Amino acid sequence: DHGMREEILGDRSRLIRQRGEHALIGICAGNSYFSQKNTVMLLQWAGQRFERTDVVYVDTHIDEMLIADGRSAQEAERSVKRTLKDLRRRLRRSLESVGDHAERFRVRSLSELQETPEYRAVRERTDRAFEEDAEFATACEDMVRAVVMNRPGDGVGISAEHLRAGLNYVLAEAPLFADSPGVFSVPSSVLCYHIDTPITAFLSRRETGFRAAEGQAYVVVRPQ
């Protein structure tokens, strides 16, 4: 046990971070980074730094991209069930490796979290913002491109259908990016991820118009 590095995304997040109230951990299917080694390293780090840590595993809109990638509707669902079986198995071993701090974690899938009225309350605001705030709409569009361009699989082509799947996926996530304090009902939250992303880069720095909720902070955490 020899830990990993932490960088704070923009001045705005600096004071919210130091207190270490809440951490949001976003996990992704098909991303090499979420190998047992790093997931366990990440989970233990948030247990030692944050008094409350929400873990969300993305299980939504994967189906759409596979159909866009040229796979049958039934071919898509079969794959998704397989991809999520392995993610759940990986996650079970990851949290098992942390143990004692499992009480300090609130692990749920995105679709499960989608059910929550507090999620739906923020989603209402984020979807409106994508259509109204040009600045945020633009940030979302770069995040869509980034999602499509880095999608899992042997797919190579890019169509309008891929973009919708991209936008759908990105819109399901936006509440967690914009108002995590409101989604999880916490006074403040820190979105933790191993890289800067178009959305985070926009929300970490934004001062006017649609922006991050007071309490929303961003930190980049990766191995040393």
Q: Residue 137 corresponds to which tokens in the numbers above? A: 């709409």
Q: Edge to edge, what strands does the sheet with 216-223 contain?
A: 4-8, 216-223, 189-193, 23-27, 53-57, 105-109
CATH (domain of 67): 3.40.50.11710
Q: At what angle do helices 117-132 and 160-178 cross, to 10 degrees?
A: 120
Full domain range(s) for residue 195: 1-224
For the chain, how many structural domains are there in total? 1
At 172, give phi and psi (nearest 5°).
-65, -35
Q: How many angstroms separate the Cα of 222 from the Cα of each of 2, 4, 20, 59?
A: 12, 6, 18, 23
Q: Residue 85 corresponds to which tokens in the numbers above? A: 């079986």
d(CA 137, CA 159): 20
Resolution (angstroms) stands at 2.9
Q: Residue 142 corresponds to which tokens in the numbers above? A: 């770069």
Q: Residue 100 corresponds to which tokens in the numbers above? A: 């004692």
Q: How many angstroms separate the Cα of 149 from the Cα of each of 80, 130, 162?
A: 19, 21, 10
Dmax over CA atoms of the chain, in Å, equals 49
Contact present, 31 and 2 (Cβ < 8 Å): no
